[PDB]
Scaffold this active site. Structure first.
Site, PDB file in Angstrom:
ATOM      1  N   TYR A  88      11.218   7.304  -7.169  1.00 21.90           N
ATOM      2  CA  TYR A  88      10.467   8.233  -6.333  1.00 21.90           C
ATOM      3  C   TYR A  88      11.396   9.291  -5.753  1.00 21.90           C
ATOM      4  O   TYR A  88      11.163  10.490  -5.913  1.00 21.90           O
ATOM      5  CB  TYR A  88       9.777   7.485  -5.190  1.00 21.90           C
ATOM      6  CG  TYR A  88       8.987   8.390  -4.272  1.00 21.90           C
ATOM      7  CD1 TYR A  88       7.892   9.112  -4.748  1.00 21.90           C
ATOM      8  CD2 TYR A  88       9.339   8.537  -2.932  1.00 21.90           C
ATOM      9  CE1 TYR A  88       7.167   9.958  -3.912  1.00 21.90           C
ATOM     10  CE2 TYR A  88       8.621   9.381  -2.087  1.00 21.90           C
ATOM     11  CZ  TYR A  88       7.536  10.087  -2.583  1.00 21.90           C
ATOM     12  OH  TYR A  88       6.821  10.922  -1.754  1.00 21.90           O
ATOM     13  N   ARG A 133       2.089   5.942   6.264  1.00 18.95           N
ATOM     14  CA  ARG A 133       2.970   6.409   5.203  1.00 18.95           C
ATOM     15  C   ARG A 133       4.118   5.414   5.036  1.00 18.95           C
ATOM     16  O   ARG A 133       4.914   5.209   5.952  1.00 18.95           O
ATOM     17  CB  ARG A 133       3.517   7.798   5.547  1.00 18.95           C
ATOM     18  CG  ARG A 133       3.456   8.786   4.390  1.00 18.95           C
ATOM     19  CD  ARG A 133       4.048  10.144   4.754  1.00 18.95           C
ATOM     20  NE  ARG A 133       3.259  10.880   5.743  1.00 18.95           N
ATOM     21  CZ  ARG A 133       2.004  11.281   5.560  1.00 18.95           C
ATOM     22  NH1 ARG A 133       1.376  11.016   4.422  1.00 18.95           N
ATOM     23  NH2 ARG A 133       1.379  11.961   6.512  1.00 18.95           N
ATOM     24  N   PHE A 159      27.011  24.652   2.030  1.00 18.73           N
ATOM     25  CA  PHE A 159      25.583  24.397   1.884  1.00 18.73           C
ATOM     26  C   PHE A 159      25.294  23.015   1.305  1.00 18.73           C
ATOM     27  O   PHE A 159      24.226  22.451   1.536  1.00 18.73           O
ATOM     28  CB  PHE A 159      24.960  25.489   1.004  1.00 18.73           C
ATOM     29  CG  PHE A 159      23.543  25.210   0.579  1.00 18.73           C
ATOM     30  CD1 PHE A 159      23.277  24.409  -0.529  1.00 18.73           C
ATOM     31  CD2 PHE A 159      22.474  25.762   1.277  1.00 18.73           C
ATOM     32  CE1 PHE A 159      21.969  24.165  -0.937  1.00 18.73           C
ATOM     33  CE2 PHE A 159      21.161  25.524   0.877  1.00 18.73           C
ATOM     34  CZ  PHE A 159      20.908  24.724  -0.232  1.00 18.73           C
ATOM     35  N   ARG A 193      15.446   6.761   8.969  1.00 21.87           N
ATOM     36  CA  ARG A 193      15.367   7.337  10.305  1.00 21.87           C
ATOM     37  C   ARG A 193      13.933   7.692  10.692  1.00 21.87           C
ATOM     38  O   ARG A 193      13.484   7.374  11.794  1.00 21.87           O
ATOM     39  CB  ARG A 193      16.259   8.581  10.383  1.00 21.87           C
ATOM     40  CG  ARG A 193      16.468   9.142  11.786  1.00 21.87           C
ATOM     41  CD  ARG A 193      15.236   9.864  12.308  1.00 21.87           C
ATOM     42  NE  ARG A 193      14.892  11.031  11.499  1.00 21.87           N
ATOM     43  CZ  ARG A 193      15.654  12.114  11.379  1.00 21.87           C
ATOM     44  NH1 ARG A 193      16.814  12.189  12.018  1.00 21.87           N
ATOM     45  NH2 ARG A 193      15.254  13.127  10.622  1.00 21.87           N
TER      46      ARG A 193
HETATM   47  C1  LIG Z   1      24.057  20.077  -3.853  1.00 19.68           C
HETATM   48  O1  LIG Z   1      23.106  19.012  -3.936  1.00 19.68           O
HETATM   49  C2  LIG Z   1      21.960  19.332  -3.143  1.00 19.68           C
HETATM   50  C3  LIG Z   1      21.086  18.085  -2.998  1.00 19.68           C
HETATM   51  C4  LIG Z   1      19.845  18.404  -2.163  1.00 19.68           C
HETATM   52  O2  LIG Z   1      19.061  17.214  -2.049  1.00 19.68           O
HETATM   53  C5  LIG Z   1      17.870  17.444  -1.431  1.00 19.68           C
HETATM   54  C6  LIG Z   1      16.997  16.377  -1.254  1.00 19.68           C
HETATM   55  C7  LIG Z   1      15.795  16.585  -0.589  1.00 19.68           C
HETATM   56  C8  LIG Z   1      15.499  17.856  -0.113  1.00 19.68           C
HETATM   57  C9  LIG Z   1      14.213  18.094   0.468  1.00 19.68           C
HETATM   58  C10 LIG Z   1      13.102  18.265   0.957  1.00 19.68           C
HETATM   59  C11 LIG Z   1      11.764  18.440   1.536  1.00 19.68           C
HETATM   60  O3  LIG Z   1      11.727  17.864   2.850  1.00 19.68           O
HETATM   61  C12 LIG Z   1      11.402  19.915   1.611  1.00 19.68           C
HETATM   62  N1  LIG Z   1      10.407  20.257   0.582  1.00 19.68           N
HETATM   63  C13 LIG Z   1      10.882  19.788  -0.728  1.00 19.68           C
HETATM   64  C14 LIG Z   1      10.884  18.268  -0.775  1.00 19.68           C
HETATM   65  C15 LIG Z   1      10.742  17.749   0.647  1.00 19.68           C
HETATM   66  C16 LIG Z   1       9.352  18.108   1.143  1.00 19.68           C
HETATM   67  C17 LIG Z   1       9.134  19.593   0.900  1.00 19.68           C
HETATM   68  C18 LIG Z   1      16.415  18.887  -0.296  1.00 19.68           C
HETATM   69  C19 LIG Z   1      16.253  20.082   0.395  1.00 19.68           C
HETATM   70  C20 LIG Z   1      16.020  21.126  -0.493  1.00 19.68           C
HETATM   71  C21 LIG Z   1      14.720  21.424  -0.887  1.00 19.68           C
HETATM   72  C22 LIG Z   1      14.461  22.575  -1.622  1.00 19.68           C
HETATM   73  C23 LIG Z   1      15.502  23.429  -1.967  1.00 19.68           C
HETATM   74  C24 LIG Z   1      16.803  23.127  -1.583  1.00 19.68           C
HETATM   75  C25 LIG Z   1      17.063  21.975  -0.850  1.00 19.68           C
HETATM   76  N2  LIG Z   1      17.561  18.659  -0.955  1.00 19.68           N
END
Ligand SMILES: COCCCOc1ccc(C#C[C@@]2(O)CN3CCC2CC3)c(Cc2ccccc2)n1
Ligand SMILES: COCCCOc1ccc(C#C[C@@]2(O)CN3CCC2CC3)c(Cc2ccccc2)n1
Ligand SMILES: COCCCOc1ccc(C#C[C@@]2(O)CN3CCC2CC3)c(Cc2ccccc2)n1
Ligand SMILES: COCCCOc1ccc(C#C[C@@]2(O)CN3CCC2CC3)c(Cc2ccccc2)n1
Lengths: 341, 341, 341, 341
Positions: free
Chosen positions: C136, C195, C255, C183
């Site tokens: 998931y 949920r 970032f 968390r």
């Molecule tokens: C260099 O490696 C980078 C790894 C980044 O790993 C992740 C993992 C999860 C998330 C996320 C998220 C969210 O809360 C925001 N949106 C996208 C998925 C969920 C719900 C809606 C994100 C945030 C994210 C979401 C969209 C674009 C960039 C980053 N990143």
């Protein structure tokens, strides 16, 4: 809208005093409390009518709260004065009840039964020991303390933690009921049949018959016995302070503090005074007004309780039996107060 | 110094509540708003005074702002009590006025004049249409929203983008005024002579004579017109939210939120309330206390406006024909609210 | 500019945090990463409505990535708050989409689809095992890793020899997501409808009812069930360090390092903490302030991670069920961090 | 006519225990008891189904009794076996319900609604105290004792005074419901998810995890606990003996006595018996045949009840903890029986 209005209209007509304090609360809080009061008032109404068979009471009161879901239930030949219209048109109460949050319905229904059952216990036995006195007060006052506390929480206006231990809440109710039982001693003593609340465990150390106090004589022990009743009451003050200082919501505070401060002022008056066995000991309208006006926040509230307490202690001689038990019940009280300033 | 101390002394005298809210602003912005209020105040003291001729008002009001640069000027024959004193000693206002930044001074004058004129327009004619209703509230309230917003931008506490579209700023003032107009109905009609603000275009559908709402006989039509009025005010709620959500400064926000939250709470009480026609409906000192405490941050503010909004829709019945106009408005209000959570 | 402005004023409206990290990036990639985020959230918004039909999701989700052009699109009855506005005004996203370079455009599309279906696969099904878990998180988080990694490459900022293997790119995502699941438990468990994301394969060992955790009478087993969750998370750590170490662009590293460090900090706080079952546990403002400040280069980053990894090991003792275990996981972590110093 | 067919048909398919005792009732009274059962049966099917949102039950179960007047009502897809077919064709029931003494209809609706809200009240909360236990058994069983008792009087077969006190009637339902809960322990604890009713206030004393009662290892504390439950149930016997002895109609007595006797017989077999924690202990069919045949007259009933109460006692020994409490409760039940002989 006609239902809630009937509730408030009969509330103010059957308990104008309390009807004023309750207006401190707002929105749904006051709504639930109002209905909560009326239900317990209706309950007590039936339990107080002596023309009603004991058995009927022993099996009806315990299920009284069940009528809270029957929007058709009501009574017709019971009730004193306006207390009658309440039972005859109870439909308005129950219908209003079904509009309150499911959270409020439970506390009310729950306490109604617990109190009702407690009343049935005393419908078959007298009040001999202090334990009886504390248990009786717990049923008609203490539990009331529990219910309200459970409401401030279910309302979200107060911290959920305020309902872990209800010991002090019970104390809040006992201080009022006892302060009342004391003052209302004369009205209750002459009524026929005579309703007695003063525990034999306390007055027997002073007389053989209680209804022998009206007599201008024996007035020496009447005072000593009265003081014993007061002292017994000053025990809850420290806890009253604790419970107040735990309240954060302004509305809930005024509604909880006003009655308490009003009680302490009442005690400081009835204490060590014979006039309690012949007439009604009440506070001056000026003192009543101010209390209802400054008891809006802890500091000022503790500031008054602190005053009345001294005006209670500074009224007896070292010759009066309880100069000791009181001198401590006073320090214990003032202490709790001083520990929040 | 002393002039300011007078303005602030006359302030709490003419309007306690506002004199408490205004304290949410810093000495900087506060000094300006206090004088801004007194100017518009003294101005209203002239309009609302039916003891004097109209040709006197249409002669003085139009050139009220001009007096701001004449620290000698003062009027000694208009108003009652305090307000009357405010004019006889208008000098202090103008004094402190000259001590304000040019930017503030001008904004206070522009609004004073534009308002003065508006008052004159409706001083020689009544409020018949809804447009009249809105336009009037604009002259006496909406403009205050414009002024304040301009002061916020001028001061620098708020971004310049705020004064781009004073539409929502106008809404802020309308929501407050309409709420007051709705609550003080009975008081304003028991005035000598009677004061009416409820637009004919509205009550015209419930009665031919507005004075009928005072008699219980027409209790149905009355409350039916009251709900229509409240519905008219709910139109501004969605906008009030937007404006409150565009504020960045913590100080300016609180000073702008509290009143709005106070209006909503008041609007939820007078809604479908008939007591409105025989007395003044108000919130509990404790509730208004809870409002001043939490109207500090947006979220806490939005959930309070939410609660009171839900309270308004709750006191509503499906039986009557206003349930529809409203159900739709409450959603737009709650929507905009959740739309920021 | 009118379109990105929206995309930004909206982004800054749902993830204030990420809306601060995303600015560490460059204009070219920032605009891309931004749109990339919005689309995904716009997606999750659809996949997270509980008052919406199921046969609507798939029928609409797998055609989600397809609708990323057709600038004539938008959904009018979806989420709540700003989110629904994002879908009701989705247009700005599709044109700011093409407006933006396309080397990225394809990456957004690819994952957008993959992720959507991964969500479909789980709509009707649920998490029973850790396999379901890691899987998931892969669709929702892991893939974001693949994506960002891809976008990094195509922009020439990072080496093309980095998008070959995506294992670690997935670890970055799972770590971030899994840490949030732990968390943000109480927050999710209280969701209405509820949920759940915790592996049935895990809590089936510390209880038999997940919603039970709300209780205060299951703590002991609830916390160790938490420790297990944290334990599972700490498995990605070594792979997190490895990835961050490969990055050579200062802008892309920050970032990608801050979120991870922020996670490790949070995870090192929720670990062996009961508070997680009755309120959100988050880093103090000062702590998170240092994270953004120092997580700019590798060495500083590896040191904070280590520090936080050494606070998660300080909470446990010999008596713990995962003690001797975590010391193992804690090592594998430090080892990696220590092999780049 | 054709509908009562469906009613009795389904009745014999769903309930194989009560179906017999019901069929032996007097036609008139029987139909009402049949429909009364089928109604609660439909309601239960809803509560007991784990494919329904519990968020919609709390919103509609309290409305379930409303459909008792809408002959066109039925539920699409819920419940398995024949119970499913029960609501799909729930019309046969409601239309049969229509042609019943209005008194019967009012009793069914009252209990139905009250029981429904009792289910909702226990869908969120669980059974921790011995209060939740008695209260739960009350909602799903005690109320059944109320309805039947009310139906008896409603038919005139029993004296109107039988409804005076419904406490014993409540004891009737609890003795049955509790015996089953004690006997169906294993069958219930092995569900998806598991189903538990044994109060924590009782087992928390014999184990840390209730599931530990399936292992031959914790076989000692399992039995010692099972005995605690049996004792708790044995408290209702004295009142059961009273309620039976109050019935004057043969048809009503047989229908009431048989189930009670069977329960005591079952209880005497599960007591101190440990197979319970893995199998379903039962009475030999030849025994339940002997009970049906003789439980038609008071003396015969009391006799069978006594001998079953005696062997339950003649099962424990000195080295048994409950030994003392059992004696008291047992001999307490015995005396009650010997009292009516
Ligand atoms: C260099 O490696 C980078 C790894 C980044 O790993 C992740 C993992 C999860 C998330 C996320 C998220 C969210 O809360 C925001 N949106 C996208 C998925 C969920 C719900 C809606 C994100 C945030 C994210 C979401 C969209 C674009 C960039 C980053 N990143
Ligand atoms: C913060 O703690 C609050 C403690 C309040 O303590 C108590 C104690 C006793 C009572 C009372 C009372 C009555 O006189 C009014 N009716 C109810 C019981 C008796 C007789 C009829 C009451 C009044 C009462 C009754 C019903 C609802 C609310 C308050 N309160
Ligand atoms: C951010 O948007 C702010 C919108 C403020 O909207 C409103 C609306 C009405 C009022 C008012 C008022 C008065 O009763 C007081 N005086 C000025 C207009 C009337 C009559 C004399 C006021 C009170 C007011 C008036 C002048 C200065 C400050 C506040 N504000
Ligand atoms: C003279 O006093 C009579 C006391 C009868 O005591 C009880 C106690 C429990 C039950 C039951 C039951 C059920 O399993 C069947 N349905 C009704 C409640 C539950 C779940 C659905 C029942 C079975 C029952 C239910 C409905 C109608 C008749 C009997 N009776």
């Amino acid at each position: 809208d006609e239902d809630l209005r009937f509730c408030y209209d009969i509330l103010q007509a059957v308990s104008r005093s309390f009807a004023v304090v309750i207006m401190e609360l707002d929105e749904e809080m006051r709504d639930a409390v109002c209905i909560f009061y009326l239900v317990l008032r209706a309950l007590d109404t039936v339990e107080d009518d002596m023309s009603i068979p004991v058995e009927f009471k022993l099996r009806e009161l315990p299920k009284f709260h069940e009528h809270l879901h029957d929007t058709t239930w009501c009574m017709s030949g019971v009730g004193v004065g306006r207390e009658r219209e309440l039972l005859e048109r109870y439909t308005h109460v129950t219908r209003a009840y079904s509009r309150l949050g499911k959270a409020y319905q439970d506390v009310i229904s729950g306490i109604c039964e617990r109190m009702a059952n407690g009343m049935c216990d005393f419908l078959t036995r007298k009040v001999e020991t202090k334990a009886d006195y504390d248990l009786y007060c717990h049923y008609v006052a203490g539990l009331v303390g529990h219910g309200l506390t459970l409401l401030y929480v279910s309302s979200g206006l107060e911290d959920v933690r305020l309902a872990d231990d209800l010991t002090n809440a019970n104390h809040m109710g006992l201080f009022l009921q006892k302060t009342n039982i004391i003052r209302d001693f004369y009205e209750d003593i002459c009524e026929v049949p005579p309703r007695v609340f003063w525990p034999r465990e306390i007055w027997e150390k002073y007389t053989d018959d209680l209804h022998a106090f009206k007599d201008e004589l024996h007035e020496a022990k009447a005072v000593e016995c009265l003081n014993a009743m007061v002292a017994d009451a000053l025990v809850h003050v420290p806890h009253v302070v604790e419970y107040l200082a735990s309240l954060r919501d302004p509305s809930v505070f005024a509604f909880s503090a006003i009655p308490q401060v009003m009680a302490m002022a009442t005690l400081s008056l009835v204490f060590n005074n014979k006039d309690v066995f012949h007439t009604k000991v009440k506070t001056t309208r000026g003192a009543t007004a101010r209390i209802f006006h400054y008891s809006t926040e802890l500091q000022a509230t503790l500031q008054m309780l602190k005053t009345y307490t001294l005006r209670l202690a500074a009224r007896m001689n070292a010759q009066d039996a309880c100069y000791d038990r009181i001198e401590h019940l006073v320090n214990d009280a003032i202490r709790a107060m001083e520990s929040h300033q």
